[PDB]
Ligand binder design. Sequence first.
Ligand code: SF4
Lengths: 112, 98, 173, 309, 173, 52, 106, 156, 83, 52
Amino acid sequence: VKPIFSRDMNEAKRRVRELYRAWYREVPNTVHLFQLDISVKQGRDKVREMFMKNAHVTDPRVVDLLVIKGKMELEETINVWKQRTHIMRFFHETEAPRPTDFLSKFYVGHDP
Amino acid sequence: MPLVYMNIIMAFAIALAGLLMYRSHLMSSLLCLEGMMLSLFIMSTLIILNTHFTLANMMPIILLVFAACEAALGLSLLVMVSNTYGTDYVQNLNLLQC
Amino acid sequence: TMYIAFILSTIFVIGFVGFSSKPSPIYGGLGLIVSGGVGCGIVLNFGGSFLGLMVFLIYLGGMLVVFGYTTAMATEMYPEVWVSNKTVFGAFVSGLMMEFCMVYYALKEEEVEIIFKFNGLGDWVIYDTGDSGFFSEEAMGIAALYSYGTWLVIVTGWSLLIGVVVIMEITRG
Amino acid sequence: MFMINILSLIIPILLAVAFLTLVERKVLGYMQLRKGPNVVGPYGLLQPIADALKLFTKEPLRPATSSISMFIIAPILALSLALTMWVPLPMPYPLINMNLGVLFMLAMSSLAVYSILWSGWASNSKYALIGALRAVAQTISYEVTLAIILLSVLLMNGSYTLSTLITTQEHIWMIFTSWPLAMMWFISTLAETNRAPFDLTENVEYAAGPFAMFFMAEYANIIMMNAFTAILFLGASHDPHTPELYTINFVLKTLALTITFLWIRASYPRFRYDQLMHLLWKSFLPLTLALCMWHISLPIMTASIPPQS
Amino acid sequence: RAAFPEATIIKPSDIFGREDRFLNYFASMRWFGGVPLISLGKETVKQPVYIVDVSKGIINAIKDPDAKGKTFAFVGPNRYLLFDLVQYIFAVAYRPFLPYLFEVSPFEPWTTRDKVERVHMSDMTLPHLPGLEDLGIQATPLELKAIEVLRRHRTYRWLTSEMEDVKPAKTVN
Amino acid sequence: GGAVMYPTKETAHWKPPPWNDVDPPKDTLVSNLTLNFGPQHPAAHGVLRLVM
Amino acid sequence: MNIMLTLLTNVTLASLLVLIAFWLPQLNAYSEKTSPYECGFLPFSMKFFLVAITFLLFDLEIALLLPLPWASQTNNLKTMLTMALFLLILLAASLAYEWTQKGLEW
Amino acid sequence: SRGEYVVAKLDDLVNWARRSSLWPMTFGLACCAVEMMHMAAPRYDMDRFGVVFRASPRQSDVMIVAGTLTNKMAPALRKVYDQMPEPRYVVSMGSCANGGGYYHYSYSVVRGCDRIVPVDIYVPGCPPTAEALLYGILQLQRKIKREKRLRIWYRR
Amino acid sequence: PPLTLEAIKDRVLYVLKLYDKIDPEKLSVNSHFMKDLGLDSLDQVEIIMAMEDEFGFEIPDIDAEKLMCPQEIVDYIADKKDV
Amino acid sequence: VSDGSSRPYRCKIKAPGFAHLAGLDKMSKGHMLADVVAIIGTQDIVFGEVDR
Ligand code: SF4
């Protein structure tokens, strides 16, 4: 199969690290640009969290596309194409926390 | 001399003092320079009128024209300097020394 | 209203202190517009109608408007008033105090002498009793520029044209 | 009694501006096959009052002015200068008779330009400054041509006295003598007041009252400039015993000129900054210079030099 | 309590938020000259509570089956010296800290005598009443939400450009 | 060779003038503006964003 | 005194209206728009300044051309006419220089 | 009482001014904007009623949401709405603006502009006829006429 | 005051101290980040970026991967500054 | 695209405005801001069809 950008997982990890550096350095500016109420640590924590969410991937092709999507979000963030709400959408705030305990779910509703 | 002449001459002195004592912006210095030209216009006008120097009533106008020419020059130099440096700060003019 | 000219001259000095304190350009430009308007008033009080309107139309109308034009396009300054940071506030206050000391030494003491001799008498005295008839001395003399001052016209015109040339050559980069 | 005259010059002009708003609305509508304000009062006569009351009750929003001081002075300057420009105008007898009234008018228009610069600079808005500077550029070019045309036409008046224009145009209107200058003068007046096609659509930060006063000052300037055009070119008969005749004729002429201002507004597409300046620098200015040469040479070559006094 | 025996009475302490009358009130001392502070507000320690924390507690109290009949007292996360609190308020609001009748106003009074007394009255401390933690809501420090309420009160260049970060004010705890 | 014949401690660090009278371009900050055609603008018809 | 009175009355009237438009209308309570001026950060093009300096110089030449109406009363009509035409020709020459060379870019 | 009489009459005067000189902003998003133009067209001529289309939202009093408010456009609508000065009224024109209409179950359509901004008058139709939109504006004028802001302040 | 190897080490260790995740007790000149300090790959990337900030240069990803010990970072900076 | 049912499987809509607006940048090169407004008009761009 034709690789999207990276032939091997090591090459893909190189792209992932490059994207992580750009996001890590952009977070301070992003807080300034959109006048966000999150701290620079909070934004960088979210960046790491988002990267760690897709940490189970093993296919270099999928990792490549994930990096491409990550780049696209960074491009919009850097170019101020996103708005303040768009950046805050990463930080789910209004959404009420849904519990994980079975007994709590049992009380909450018929949630499977 | 009448007190009005004293006041105008004092205005010239004050503007000269402000021009010689720069602060930051070269624009402020140019403003002081042009103020001095205004004060000289007023002084010469009053003198010519009181003396009834009819043939010399054209002197203030010529002074005014040349004053604004030298100003057009100052502004042109200021924008060249600002475009090069980014601001019109007098401190930027430091490449030439001694 | 016998000392109106003296009041105007004092306000002229005050405005000169205001813009000579080198404040924020926008505030200074005003310090100059105000002083310029006062000076025009003084010239009108002496009878120079044409010259009074000259400064209003050219100096205040054009020269200071192009000055403001530049300050507006190249705006790299933090706005501050004459009574702002001590660098400007102290200078403004001290200039006003010096002017007031001169005024007091001028009115209370008739023969005030700092560098020139000044007389505390109202400036109305210096006015001359005379009739011009159907004449505007200022206007007639200034119009004589085209008749008597041909040389002045030539030199001033050449200076203007070469000024346009010089401005372009300087602001061509 | 003199204060009564000042009030009788200021208040009627403001009321005239208020009703001029309605007149413009209706005229534009009927030129667009529409009925202007017709519900608010009979024939919309109460529309300006409704607009004023609504404006002076709307929540004023603050535009983060870098210098409230300056942001507030700009409206004052505009309105005061607009009111002052009406003073020297001879409706047969002027309120303040100046030997150099014309130059006074020109100087007052020149100061008015500052209101634009002050408004944009103090607004703390990049778009505001850009637009303000564009207005500066537009008014810059008009002033040159306006001054040249005014000088050239006054070369047959004999002085800068506004009252003398009535005597000069006693037999023939000045326009019949200087119609090209009249054309350029009218277009220059359009450019001065930024009336279309010299608008730059898309001092907006002004809210309600401030905006309302700026609007009033601009429209008063429109009416005053049309009056100046009337006195300069469309001379009116004045009977010294009965001045009301001249007053009526002059008012009618000014109204006609303002109606032409609206008529042009809804007749032509708006210019472009480059096009406006390539008019007021490369079409009007050379022609104004040539016509100034002609209007200097003509009185001498025709032995028609007007009396100095 | 007499009419409604099982009423769940809540006693918040100086709720702060975007449309609050406590943080914004201090940041509005500009109208009242400098910073009018009785005895420089040196003997007053206040415990401010976040608006969302109070609201969430109210909702939690409704759901809570044992909250009925219990008088809750919503306390803030930290107790701040009134002087330090106002200093912090003006600090993040980019306002010069100048440490230094309105009842008459028929429209909404700018200041009330009782309000003045309540402002200079140090907040009580009742450890015998259930608090936010009893309802599960975790108190949010004023520091985190301070900018959201007071950045909008910025003067010229502190929400951008300089953007100096003011450290948390000392808490009297 | 050097800025001055007898240099001081402060002047020692100071660099002699460039060979050509051309001082290097400093910063070279771009002045290209990035305007946004806000939708409310009439021409945008309310539903158009033109990053320009 | 009359012209001074007119200036005073106009200025005071305008300032009073500014008072009743800046402070009177804002007395009415309209809640509070807790909306910050979100700012997060220069077109000094010669295209503008050039329009300004050239205007200054042309305005200066216009100033020299103002005394013309009274200058027509001189007995030395030929000399006055020549000088006036000279000033106008110089104005045209300045315009031509800018037009022929890289100017009038506005 | 006399105080009530004075306040009521003044309130009526204020109400008359606003309802007579309503200045709407054209937030034309979709098909409904075309009918809005036909309202300002000569046949109906909203200006005849004093309702002049104010391009500047900073000088507007009524926001006529005309079209389908998509998720991408939703933040802009609210941000423009809060930048409007008060008193500000929102008129929802069209089923798409009212509750999504044809695109209610779309993945990128707000289920009614009511969620984003509070609405005062809902104009039904797809597109609502220009008379219906004109009817809604007149209904808003009557709604303003009924408002008693001053009276409540006095009776507070 | 030319940069010294000791000064380079001092600044490197200072940056590591500023990094809250690193335990000061386990911090050492040769303490491997991923083994001795037990950090993640992203943590190593963060440390490399912090070093770039401290010494005002840029490390490519390849060299960043190479830098697995504080002493290794010190040596790389020594080569970078030619000290 | 019909699958033989009473509901279309896929309905792609070719909007003429979509391609025209894509070429706006090419047409707008070397023009002023006001020219962009004219270029939008000459392409007759309705965002209803462009965004489909
Ligand atoms: S309601 Fe109908 S006409 Fe209006 S926008 Fe929606 S689909 Fe189009």
